[PDB]
């Protein structure tokens, strides 16, 4: 079976769009209608004319698309496409922090459950966390789940950051070390380093640019050679966008298992079977939607 041909036909039959994250397998990126980071996928979720969304990404991302498109069918091809860091944050963490700091806005990374977003004042992604936190009317904000992004936000805004939970992090980005920075500079001495803010702070400090994957794409025009400190499928994405540049993985083994639960075959099966339908309870969705819409307004 020609999976690509079958998917193209089913997209037409289902009036479906495929939205893909930047960490998707190359063959999935190649059949997606739109590819982007967390923030771009959320905005693109607000101008969907199609009836069905196939979300080639992890669960919290498909949930966000469903919150913004409650009357469209949102399909996740595997329920094992999940984010380890997003599931570190529970409602009880948020409520405990709200108790200690009732006047602190609750700022939740989009890497969170819809249930957790129901208790947020505003959501953020890596691309807009600093701008959003800067503009909130408070010198202290509750922020999670990623402590490494928390550190970056604190450094850039000067505000006091109350992490929820205590040790939230992404195992993929925590793989990068100072030895990887030293190896990169030795193998590719003419390259600059683009580093995701989910990397540990001492690695962040070695960056030529700190950026979300979306900002990596935006700023890649500033140099012709880059070592890429994020999930390794980002190198494919950058190479396709800028064939005239050179991109090298900082670590080939920087692999997100949840992202790679999505396959060409189960995208085909997703459209064929109309599964797995993503649903968000109306009251959770209403409250999460308020925080997300406020994020999109605050840029």
C-beta of 235 vs 256, nearer to ligand SF4: 256
Give the bridge partners for 292, in sequence order: none
Asked whether residue 21 is marked as a ligand-binding residue, the answer is yes
Q: How far is the CB of 32 from ligand SF4 (least distance, A)?
A: 17
Please state the three-class secondary structure of 139-174 as a single string: CEEEEECCHHHHHHHHHHHCCEEEECCCCCCCCCHH
DSSP state for residue 87 in the 8-state scheme: G
Q: How far is the CB of 24 from ligand SF4 (least distance, A)?
A: 11
Closest-CA residue to 150 (of 88, 99, 91): 88
C-beta of 68 vs 256, nearer to ligand SF4: 256
Q: How far apart are CA 154 and CA 159, in angstroms?
A: 6
Asked whether residue 188 is marked as a ligand-binding residue, the answer is no
Asked whether residue 197 is marked as a ligand-binding residue, the answer is yes
Residue 198: C-alpha distances to residues 46, 153, 163, 190 (Å): 26, 11, 14, 24
Q: How far is the CB of 8 from ligand SF4 (least distance, A)?
A: 27
Asked whether residue 221 is marked as a ligand-binding residue, the answer is no
Asked whether residue 199 is marked as a ligand-binding residue, the answer is no
Q: How far is the CB of 269 from ligand SF4 (least distance, A)?
A: 22
Q: How far is the CB of 185 from ligand SF4 (least distance, A)?
A: 24
C-beta of 104 vs 120, nearer to ligand SF4: 120
Asked whether residue 111 is marked as a ligand-binding residue, the answer is yes
C-beta of 54 vs 83, nearer to ligand SF4: 83
Token couple for 264: 């060409």
- Classified as helix, coil or strand, 90 is coil
Label the pairing between strands 192-195 and 160-163.
unpaired
Which positions touch ligand SF4 (CB under 6 A)?
Answer: 58, 83-85, 111, 170, 172, 231, 256, 258-259
Q: How far apart are CA 288 and CA 267, in angstroms?
A: 27
Q: How far apart are CA 21 and CA 57, in angstroms?
A: 5
C-beta of 254 vs 291, nearer to ligand SF4: 254
Asked whether residue 91 is marked as a ligand-binding residue, the answer is no
Annotated binding site for iminosuccinate: 21, 38, 109-111, 126, 196-198, 213
Annotated binding site: 21, 38, 83, 109-111, 126, 170, 196-198, 213, 256
């Amino acid at each position: 079976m020609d999976l690509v041909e079958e998917i193209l036909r089913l997209k037409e039959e289902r009036n479906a769009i495929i939205l893909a994250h930047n960490y998707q397998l190359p063959e999935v990126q190649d059949i997606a209608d739109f590819i982007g980071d967390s923030l771009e996928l959320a905005r693109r979720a607000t101008r969907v004319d199609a009836d069905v969304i196939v979300f080639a990404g992890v669960d919290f991302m498909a949930e966000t698309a469903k919150i913004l498109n409650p009357d469209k069918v949102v399909l996740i091809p595997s329920r094992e496409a999940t984010c380890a860091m997003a599931n570190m944050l529970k409602v009880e963490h948020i409520l405990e922090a709200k108790r200690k700091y009732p006047n602190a806005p609750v700022v939740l990374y989009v890497n969170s459950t819809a249930e957790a977003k129901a208790y947020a004042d505003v959501t953020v992604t890596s691309a807009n966390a600093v701008e959003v936190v800067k503009k909130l009317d408070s010198d202290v904000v509750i922020f999670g789940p990623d402590k490494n992004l928390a550190h970056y936000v604190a450094k850039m805004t000067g505000k006091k950051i109350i992490p929820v939970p205590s040790k939230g992090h992404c195992y993929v980005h925590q793989k990068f070390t100072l030895d990887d920075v030293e190896r990169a500079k030795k193998l590719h001495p003419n390259a600059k380093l683009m580093i995701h803010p989910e990397c540990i702070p001492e690695v962040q400090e070695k960056a030529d640019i700190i950026a979300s994957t979306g900002g990596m794409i935006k700023r890649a025009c500033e140099w012709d050679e880059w070592v890429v400190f994020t999930e390794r499928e980002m190198v494919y994405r950058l190479r396709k966008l800028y064939p005239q540049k050179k991109f090298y993985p900082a670590r080939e083994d920087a692999f997100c298992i949840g992202m790679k639960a999505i396959t060409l075959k189960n995208i085909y099966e997703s459209l064929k079977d109309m599964k797995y339908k993503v649903e968000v309870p109306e009251e959770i969705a209403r409250k999460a939607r308020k925080a997300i819409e406020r994020m999109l307004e605050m840029s």
